[PDB]
Amino acid sequence: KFYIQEPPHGSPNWLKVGLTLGTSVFLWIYLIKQHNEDVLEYKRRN
Amino acid sequence: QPDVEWAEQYGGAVMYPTKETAHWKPPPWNDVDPPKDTLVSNLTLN
Amino acid sequence: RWQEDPEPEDENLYEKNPDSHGYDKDPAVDIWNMRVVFFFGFSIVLVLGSTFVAYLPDYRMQEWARREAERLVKYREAHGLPIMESNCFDPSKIQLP
Amino acid sequence: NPIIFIIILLTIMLGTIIVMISSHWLLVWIGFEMNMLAIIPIMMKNHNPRATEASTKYFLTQSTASMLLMMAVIINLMFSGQWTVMKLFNPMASMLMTMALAMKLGMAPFHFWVPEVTQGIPLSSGLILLTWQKLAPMSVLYQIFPSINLNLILTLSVLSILIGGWGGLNQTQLRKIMAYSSIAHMGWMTAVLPYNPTMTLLNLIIYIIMTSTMFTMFMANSTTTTLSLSHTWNKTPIMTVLILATLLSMGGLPPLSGFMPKWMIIQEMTKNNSIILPTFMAITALLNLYFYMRLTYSTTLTMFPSTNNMKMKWQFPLMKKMTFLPTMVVLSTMMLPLTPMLSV
Amino acid sequence: XXXXXXXXXXXXXXXXXXXXXXXXXXPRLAFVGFLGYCSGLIDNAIRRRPVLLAGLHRQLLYITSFVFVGYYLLKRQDYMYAVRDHDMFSYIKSHXXXXXXXXXXXXXXXXXXX
Amino acid sequence: XXXXXXXXXXXXXXXXXXXXXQAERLAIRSRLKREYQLQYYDPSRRGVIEDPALVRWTYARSANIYPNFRPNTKTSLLGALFGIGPLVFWYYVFKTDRDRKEKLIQEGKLDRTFNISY
Amino acid sequence: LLDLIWLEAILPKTISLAQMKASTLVTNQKGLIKLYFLSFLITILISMILFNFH
Amino acid sequence: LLQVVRDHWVHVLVPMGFVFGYYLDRKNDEKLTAFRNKSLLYKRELKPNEEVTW
Amino acid sequence: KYIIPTIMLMPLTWLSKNNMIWVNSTAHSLLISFTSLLLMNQFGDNSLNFSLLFFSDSLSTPLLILTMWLLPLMLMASQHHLSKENLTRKKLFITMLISLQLFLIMTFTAMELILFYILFEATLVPTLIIITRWGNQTERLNAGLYFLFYTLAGSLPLLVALIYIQNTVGSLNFLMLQYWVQPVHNSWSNVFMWLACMMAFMVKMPLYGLHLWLPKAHVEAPIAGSMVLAAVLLKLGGYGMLRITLILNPMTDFMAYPFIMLSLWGMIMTSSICLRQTDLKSLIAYSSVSHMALVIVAILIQTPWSYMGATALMIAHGLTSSMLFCLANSNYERIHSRTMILARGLQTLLPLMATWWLLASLTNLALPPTINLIGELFVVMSTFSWSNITIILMGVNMVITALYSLYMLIMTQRGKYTYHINNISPSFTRENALMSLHILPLLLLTLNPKIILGPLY
Amino acid sequence: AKTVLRQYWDIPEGTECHRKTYATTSIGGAAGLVVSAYSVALKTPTSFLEGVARTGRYTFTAAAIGAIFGLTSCISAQVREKPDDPLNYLIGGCAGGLILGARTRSYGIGAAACAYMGLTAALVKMGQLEGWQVFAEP
Amino acid sequence: XXXXXXXXXXXXXXXXXXXXXXXXXXXXXXXXXXXXXXXXXXXXXXXXXXXXXXXXXXXXXXXXXXXXXXXXXXXXXXXXXXXXXXGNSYRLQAWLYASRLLQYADALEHLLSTGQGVVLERSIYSDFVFLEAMYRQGFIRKQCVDHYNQVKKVTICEYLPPHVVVYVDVPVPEVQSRIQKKGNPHEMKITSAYLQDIENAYKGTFLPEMSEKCEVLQYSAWEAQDAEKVVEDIEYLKYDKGPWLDQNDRNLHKLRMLVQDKLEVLNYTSIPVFLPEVTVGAHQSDQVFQEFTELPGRKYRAGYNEDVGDKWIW
Incomplete structure (x- = not known):
């Protein structure tokens, strides 16, 4: 069949697919850095 | 199973058959068109 | 007029094109399910589970209370006059009214 | 409607911010009017004979309503003097103030415009805006909740x-059912x-998300x-499961997120020694469920x-948050027990 | 408390009081994380795509967004419940007359028949 | 129900109207039997036959509840006295027995000394 | 009498009367902005005269 | 190795789900550490083992 | 230990291939039910709490084991149905049972009243979807709406009841903490406090008035007969009457007096109708009213002997009525109608199933001590200490207990079957296995019924 | 006015009912005028001739409900002992719902919902004790 | 979100020799179909004539659905030997109207984005001529006509321009002899009264089309089959007073959004009203939905599909 009359999505976009996988990396590093900072602040206070 | 006769009971009119107000007709599928005419349209001068 | 309403047909496995089965379609699926794992629960939950139920792990002080009662009877009979019950958990209460 | 349509939509977003961040009584009047001049064009859009009737009915019932608010603003100059949105002070001013708020939120004697205005919108995008506009006068009520006489606020709720x-009950129009679902939920608000x-603000968080999910499920055209x-049979069958889940949560049912506001409304009311009023709230809540019950039979x-x-x-619709928000709308009972404190 | 008296109005999280320590890998966070995965399952029901579980790998965005917002949302939960308790204990300490203590009794109660 | 004489062969006449009356009964009896005969005597069937008379018999008790009862009259109120009534009948029986028992516990003991169960 | 009609007549009693109360709101007031605004005249008078508050 | 892994994939999850439930529900006792040696009912002094029993 | 492996049944049915499904759902459920008996049975003098208050221990609930017993059994009889339709539809209505099993475990385990309430009404949602679909006969909605508007109309008053208690008297929570509760002073303002806690459980446990909730759910069959076993679980799902009457209102029994008299007439009149009825499923539906009416009597007496009979009857009825409905389903799958008179013929066509028909019927009567003799007789013995008059009314009911069972037997024990040509194969290997998995657990309870009745036993 | 409603609670403390019956007409009359005001929105034909006709049927019947309720409560108080009871007002509540069947020739409706109206009327005097509160602050 | 601030905009790189042409209403015999193929000398793209399998011609993937999978009881050969009570009759024509409306939306989408002249064989403004010819004889009931007029009022008004270039061919009354000479045996032995009414209704269809100030050129049988004569006539004639000359910013952007999505254009095409010749039965609809999902074509739908393409998981 090979999807006739041109499909709306080819499947690899890279412009949209690449950044969406990139945003998860930006979120994961940001959360652990504040997590270590919160424990360091709690130990300094108490 | 529910048939076409059951769908006509819940058809677009009044949900509940009308007691006094039954003259009100059902609205169009994608925004009703009202009066095409009943307008002056172009002025005449002597 | 019905148009498309008439479609109902009687269906039964029975024995025709099944020989002897319980599961609908395929002889390979039937034997491995309806006679093996159907009866594996019959062997573990019923037969191996019969050892438990209430027999073995005491079950809410049913066997413990008998040994506890007998030693309390012989102790109170030799020294005291009243047998077990006389004033249950009451020793010098702060008035009433 | 090209680029400037987003700018018109932005002024409603910015309009509520003026109401949110405010200390002056005339500043919120500006904030309400920022919405007045910006919703009407989206109410029209395609220009229809039904749209012309709805927009005029939306204007006249709401512009006169805000004009009653300005009287209460001016009584705050005659009495108590100061221009601050902290307290209402006068009982004479509160009577005209609460009725002006009832014209937008209380609804009990001012519902009349809602079933005609909500039906009159030709587009699904305009349906979201009326459920989002109700956030604006709630910010006013959260500021001046003391001093106002409770005898004529709780009547607007009951x-x-x-x-x-x-x-x-006697409505088959899908827009009309959601129009009276507003008034039914607005009783819990007041x-x-x-x-x-x-x-009270968390009631909005549950409601607005639940209503925004509802109309975005009707992006596949249905009126x-x-x-x-x-x-179910002709179109997408798996889509109707999410319509079922959102409608079940619209009424008071425990394994869904929509029961979680109904928890604290009764809980805080029972603490104030009132039992006879919350009983009446629960029996009337059954009548709300019936509309969603008949609509789940589709x-x-x-x-x-x-x-x-x-x-x-x-099918390829807009669907801005029609995938993330229904998951919160279907199940948030275990997710939000201590979240009452997080909002305010 | 609903109205702020000691706490600063309009805060990103708290900032005035930071010392509390947020929960690490909590059972509460796992349920919000499960809903992030659940939102990435029913999105393929709307836009008809093959397999809900083994479909598009844009699900990672849906899980992370629920965790990131949820972590901040639960941080306020631990903060607001602490302030609620802090003002409660301070009310007893400052007034003292409002609270009363009673311990050890010998009072008669009515007994039920049948 | 039975009368003075048991009905089995009492009061029978040939006449002309009664002769046609038995002809009317056999006309329906043979008609409903032949459609059973066409359904029973073939190997191609295999299954349980419906019969419209038996389905309507089950439908008489399971359904036709709220289509009826629209003339309530005085017959429905007599049935209510036979239903809700006997519930009020035992209210003056169980209470009188309990008030007899409760008075005995406080003054003039009637309960047995060798009683411990419940 | 009882197990199908009278003992049932608790919730159908609050359906037959509920639908009668339902019809007095939906089918009532056949459109018209005129009629809805005539009802708002009374609502202010209830809060001022009938209910004692200011 | 190829015949077993391809055919069975969901069959392993249920008995492993019991072990996962066994570990999670047991570790909840570590949150409730209060009253371990205190209150004389099953209290005993430690000789070799630390904190009686978990 | 209990929850989590039950939740893992949801990804099990969906991930597995289309040819299997039923093999994985039944086999994996049986090994979880074995582990429930392994741990829950252990208790001291007073049953000590399991963990933190999410799911707690059992004090007087061996009824959880019954839910685990039906956990695979609610899949066995539903095999005849659902097979004709789509593969995606099969997976959906197995997971609705898994969701039922998820919420039903939570009700009996968690020692609460506040969070118990949001699990009490939570069982109604999956059953509603179950009843409103797959119904072969019509009026699904005239039973589906009646399923909620009987229960929710009575149970929503718990929100104004339970919260009112915790706002004044400490907190409900653990029940093991609930000793703060002071006896009620008995006043006209305290009348609606007692009624709101009772009326919720007066619907699920059927009486004489407001009892029509149950026959509509049974006659209009959801799916085949395996979902009717879940409708039996809903009757015993209102077990909180054991907990509320003992703790929340100990002094209040004067207002219980009219409610006993209502349930006492819900024994003669409910049995009389259960004689001349046409439907085979209806003659189990009305016998289930009277059998569960015995429990309601026992609760409101509040004697220590009555709770022994109450806890026994919850398990006794939970495996005898469900057994009877499987026999009703086995005739419904062959004759395709629930009529008793039309479906006539045992031993001649159904040789081995007729012995299962006998064992199921006689268990409704007082046989050699299986569970129902420990159930029914214990209540009758406890009613005499309440009042001497009771056994004159209760003895008449013992005559008509035979008239449920024997009338179901005799109207099927005629070897005519002239109109019927179907039912060639008597029973499949799974169909005979269903009948054994209901009676043989009760036959094992003959040796030790300690795990059948245990409120301080 | 709430001052009119507060007068209703002070009289039944004694035995006098001659002024209590006069006070009950103002409660039912003013409440009837509220429903009478909303019925104007149904569009009345002509002017004044039919306008008074619609107001006449609603206000006179609603005042009659309150007037009989005040009378029947005092007859039930004078006959036998007991000052105030929910059972005492239940008999008076049944008489208030009985006269609704006199409005239209059908014998039922009012008599059909006589137990429903009688129970709701009893619920008003159920809240004479401290246990029931309609509106509360703390 | 729709982008209008970007480089891609309406009216730009269009309108200059890009207007749509239609050769419609030329009896039962396909005479306009041959002349339309030669008319694509000035125009860039040419579209094929719509039949029963016209919506499924492209749709998802290449091959068309087989008989029952596309539409229940729909065949062009079945309409030649038309039968009353239980059959095709109207539901084929309702499917025929929906198919022509769908291909018109894609042709307008091809016109708006990248300015290319698209010639359509038998437009949406020609289907009412085909219905009314059969209505004169005893085939279609009066209630089915009212069902057609309700769809007619809604679907047409949403699209702003009808057609700039209109070609109407009026042949001889002995057109049935030309149809008998054609290669198709199933199309032969058609009613002469239906063909005569089709020419009569086309006479009252060209006049309202000219009343809306749309350019129309009449051609006879002797004037037919000409490439040079047809191209020179369309180029010389200037578009005036027509409704095609609309707003470039507001009007052109709104019509483009409705034409872009196939599901949005056919959303108003399905009527809530029930009709006997419309197939209302849900039992047949459940079996048809199961077979379409099991089909190797769409199955999972929208780009990604197992055992058909499958490029990436993400």
């Missing part, structure tokens, strides 16, 4: 669920305002019960809406 619980200011009926039952015309091509 009567609203009565007229909301009866006003959806009940927590006298009894503990918190959870009547019979038009939403032909969806998703559960067969109902025979097959039709000759069939769709094969995949």
